[PDB]
Design a protein around this ligand. Structure first.
Ligand SMILES: COc1ccc2cc([C@H](C)C(=O)O)ccc2c1
Ligand SMILES: COc1ccc2cc([C@H](C)C(=O)O)ccc2c1
Lengths: 115, 379, 379, 115
């Protein structure tokens, strides 16, 4: 009945800034299981970045972005917040959430671009 | 009454079938000649080379402009009366699923007509039975092995959506399948992914994993997962060029040239003997003959030699087959179980143990049961 | 001169042979369908079931009381003139062994007569060539595959005594072989043991290991190691019952009954197509076509298409074959190399690389060479 | 040219005695390689007992007769001597030599029998 995923926080910024990404959800019974965050480069590839899930104290990261990006889930507002710091210039790619309610639901709404 | 010569002409064309089967069953269990890894070598050959060149020889010789259209209706009336009653069962009862609908359909209205049915009925009612038994082989390889192929895809395309979209199954528009997938089964991990659009439209993409919908949507996902299962099946390339040559040849009276006709007749003559030799190897790879139990093996010979023929005895008074055509229509339904309905149940795992019993146990009683129907119709 | 129809009747019965071979060569190297472990499944079937039932059908139909005894002498004169000159080489020269005598004998006087020779010559000189080409198949499967079987045992029964009895080889009376051994080769460890008697008599027992003699002695050890290689070979049970039925049937005019004749004709018709399909798999299991080198592959086609036929051109003036029988005798010697002389050289390791070349390279030039002999004899 | 193997030493004796078996050879070029001694029971079987060969300082023995029977080769007289002590009552079997000149040559001549 018109299920909705809302993304916010992105934009254009220079190198060395800070952004606060978001992924708001509404209209699900459970909506916890295993959520992700990943990039989508203009060179056709896609690297999985961060994940928070039902454990909460376990985050699966990559090697290049290891220990530098902050992930946080709000179970009350049904929103996962993504804080990113020391933004490298290779961030022209689109960065969005991959919520999972048993099957993977996704959106596309950001314009993350770092000069 | 009958003669003793008619009993002899049956044994002339049924004894060379069992000789080609006992030598296959003996040379594995008794003398241990073939390794069971090497046993897959012959079963690979018969499925690809012998049979699709054998079915091409019967279809491209059968006249399409003189098919007995009255006999062809009273066999398309068995497969509709049985198909109408089973869908009345799976949608009104309290325990009727679709996993029992197809299995109770392959046991009743799909005999073994090509390999075993043609030489038996040719040795019982002259040579015009040898033309009628080809006219059913054409319809099985072009309709009734295709309508059954949709019923396994619809069995699969319902599970993958109902398992993983239980809450918002009603607002999906298009479904996109990557070309890696050949069978949405659960054999492969099948990471399912769903795009979200603005106004409730919801694109769904089915992928490969590393490390109810509208009826205008299910009738697109199925037709993609049938076109990928039909251009790989070699028998679909046999019956396509068989009908196309037969519509050309029997109008302008063109006879097929001897350079091509003898090029196919060197493999097609190696098709009927090897098929009974490949089937004889199959009845020794199993651990037991009766696998699922003695309470369901007799159920196989209850929906095949009784409910099979006796529904054509009432589907032949309606169309108007009397005399000699009535006896040939009843006997061709009491033939043992075909092998192509097993091949489907082995891939999709829809009861492989029942159809593995009905083929092997069906062959061992196929002779002393149809001979009872030859006597009781001759009086 | 000739007609264009005679060129057509050759291609009617030679094109279906190469179609059954290209599909075997293609489906391994190009499309990769058969696993090479499963490739041994078909080669196990053709050696045991297809061929010994195919040779039984030709021998038990051939009339023995009307064999062309003049044609049967001018092919037993090729295989004696060649056999007399090679033993003059291995006992007078300075480098003549026996390991080169047999290999220079199988390349010259043993063509492929059963599978390929019969349909070619039937399509060149009417139907009486189809009876003459059976009358050579009988003599190969009963004499010239047996005299050659003694020459590999005498090659083996000389090495085992001359290696391990170099000093007192002249005073041995009896030789006893345990029934474990099937081939005194060196494949098995073969602990040799010698009893000592009082007056120079010396019994020798050949065993299995765990963890010159008088000519009245060598002609007992050989006849034990041939009787054990002859009651296991399935083709020796084909030609034995083939001759026995043919001596009965063509005197009291008994025709073979249709229950038995159709019992064999379901496997024998699956024999000629499968043999060319099994041979086509063999020309892709090898790493290279030309294996031992380009200086000996042309030596194979030098002792097979030249020294083979041109010694029957002088062995036919002597017996007195002119006219039409002269042309059929020359052409049946230029046929490509048989497969049974390879089978021996693979077990006993007497040059397996040369005969593996001459079979495969012999098939690829068999057609445009015998067609040259059809033209040059027609002028 | 009438090659000859000569065995001597055996006979009938009670339990606990001592015997000196022999195996004399004549008429060979080399006659060293790997010689043996073995039993032949009336229960159809045959157990290999002792061996002296080209090494000389290596004797292959069994388990039941281990370290109790004396083997000695005389390279001059072409004779191998076998001294046996503490003769068990299960010695009714025939005990003879198995000389090897590239192939195994053997005799049969003893009457070893212990009551
Ligand atoms: C590996 O053994 C097989 C495979 C496929 C077969 C197909 C058929 C035809 C198409 C049919 O009877 O309906 C017959 C026998 C067969 C044996
Ligand atoms: C595994 O392929 C074979 C094995 C044996 C064969 C025998 C023959 C006959 C006996 C012959 O030609 O002389 C033919 C072809 C054959 C192919």
């Amino acid at each position: 009945s018109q299920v909705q995923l809302v993304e916010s926080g992105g934009g254009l910024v220079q190198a060395g800034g800070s952004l606060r990404l978001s992924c708001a959800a509404s209209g699900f019974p459970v909506d916890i299981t295993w959520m992700e965050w990943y990039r989508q480069a203009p060179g056709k590839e896609r690297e999985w970045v961060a994940a928070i899930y039902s454990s909460g104290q376990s985050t699966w990261y990559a090697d290049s972005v290891k220990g530098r990006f902050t992930i946080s889930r709000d179970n009350a507002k049904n929103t996962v917040y993504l804080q990113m710091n020391s933004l490298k210039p290779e961030d022209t790619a689109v960065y969005y959430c991959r919520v999972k309610v048993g099957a993977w639901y996704k959106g596309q709404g950001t314009q993350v671009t770092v000069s | 009454m009958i003669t003793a010569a008619d009993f002899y002409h049956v044994m002339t064309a049924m004894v060379p079938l069992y000789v080609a089967m006992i030598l296959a069953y003996g040379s594995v269990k008794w003398w241990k000649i073939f390794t069971p890894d090497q046993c897959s070598g012959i079963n690979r050959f018969v499925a690809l080379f012998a049979v699709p060149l054998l079915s091409f020889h019967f279809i491209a010789a059968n006249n399409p402009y003189a098919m007995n259209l009255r006999f062809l209706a009273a066999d398309s009336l068995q497969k509709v009366i049985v198909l109408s009653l089973l869908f009345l069962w799976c949608k009104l009862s309290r325990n009727g699923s679709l996993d029992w609908t197809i299995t109770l359909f392959s046991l009743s209205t799909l005999p073994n007509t090509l390999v075993m049915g043609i030489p038996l009925l040719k040795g019982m009612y002259g040579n015009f039975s040898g033309d009628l038994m080809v006219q059913i082989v054409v319809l099985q390889c072009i309709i009734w092995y295709t309508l059954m192929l949709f019923l396994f895809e619809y069995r699969g395309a319902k599970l993958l959506i109902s398992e993983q979209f239980p809450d918002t199954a009603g607002s999906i528009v298009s479904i996109h399948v990557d070309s890696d997938i050949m069978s949405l089964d659960g054999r492969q991990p099948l990471e399912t992914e769903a795009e979200i659009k603005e106004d409730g439209k919801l694109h769904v993409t089915v992928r490969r994993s590393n490390a109810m919908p509208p009826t205008s949507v299910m009738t697109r996902l199925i037709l993609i997962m049938v076109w990928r299962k039909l251009i790989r099946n070699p028998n679909s390339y046999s019956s396509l060029f068989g009908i196309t040559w037969s519509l050309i040849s029997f109008k302008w009276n063109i006879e097929m040239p001897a350079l091509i006709a003898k090029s196919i007749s060197i493999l097609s003559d190696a098709g009927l003997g090897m098929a009974m030799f490949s089937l004889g190897l199959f009845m020794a790879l199993n651990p037991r003959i009766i696998a699922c139990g003695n309470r369901r093996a007799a159920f196989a010979a209850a929906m095949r030699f009784v409910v099979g023929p006796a529904v054509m005895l009432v589907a032949s008074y309606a169309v108007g087959l009397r005399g000699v055509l009535l006896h040939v229509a009843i006997i061709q339904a009491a033939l043992p179980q075909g092998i192509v309905p097993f091949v489907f149940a082995k891939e999709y795992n829809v009861h492989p143990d029942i159809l593995s019993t009905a083929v092997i146990f069906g062959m061992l009683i196929a002779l002393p049961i149809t001979l009872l129907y030859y006597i009781l119709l001759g009086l």
